[PDB]
Amino acid sequence: AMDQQAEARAFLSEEMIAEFKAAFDMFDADGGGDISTKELGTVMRMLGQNPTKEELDAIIEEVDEDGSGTIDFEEFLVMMVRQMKEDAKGKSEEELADCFRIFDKNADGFIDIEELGEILRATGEHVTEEDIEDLMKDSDKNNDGRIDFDEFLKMMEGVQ
Ligand SMILES: [Ca+2]
Ligand SMILES: [Ca+2]
């Protein structure tokens, strides 16, 4: 939708929008402003996105409700932006998992105040022992003294 399309544009820098167009145009000989739904996956992949086939199929079904077999550049930017958000969140969850495992030194599944202090101290920041204990306090939601992955994610993400 026109709304959605205006928000996809807002999300991206103008040079990036022109870089996307440059690739996109390359599959539009017609200089119609649209490409074949059959090429959608290729241009997304080229632009470093990775939709699943199921995802590709969902999208095509969503833009090709008239049967013309094409996707226009405005609709393509809405798809691109949806895929980038899904992807960036995914990396972020993956990396978080990795910071957890590392924090959990003894790999018992929990961070304790000794492991929380060690990793915070190691930063070079001047954290005092009551500053580490406050962080613990605030993040430990079931008050068992440690930080489990669930509580880790809430502490890191924030809001979370
Ligand atoms: Ca541990
Ligand atoms: Ca806890």
Describe this structure in words.
- Helix content is 62%, strand content 6%.
- The radius of gyration is 23 Å and the shape is elongated.
- By secondary structure, it is mainly alpha-helical.
- It has helices at 2-11, 14-25, 40-46, 53-63, 73-103, 113-121, 129-139, 149-157, and strands at residues 34-36, 70-72, 110-111, 147-148.
- The strands form 2 sheets. Strands 1-2 form a two-stranded antiparallel ribbon.
- The chain has 2 domains: 1-74, Orthogonal Bundle (Recoverin, domain 1); 75-160, EF-hand (Recoverin, domain 1, Orthogonal Bundle), CATH 1.10.238.
- It has 8 helices and 4 strands, in the order ααβααβαβααβα.
- The structure holds calcium ion (2 copies).
Give me the secondary-structure topology:
Blueprint: H1 2-11, H2 14-25, E1 34-36, H3 40-46, H4 53-63, E2 70-72, H5 73-103, E3 110-111, H6 113-121, H7 129-139, E4 147-148, H8 149-157
Antiparallel strand pairs: 1-2, 3-4
Helix pairs in contact: 1-5, 6-7
Bound molecules: calcium ion (2 copies).
Family: Belongs to the troponin C family.
Pfam family, one: EF-hand_7
Protein name: Troponin C, skeletal muscle
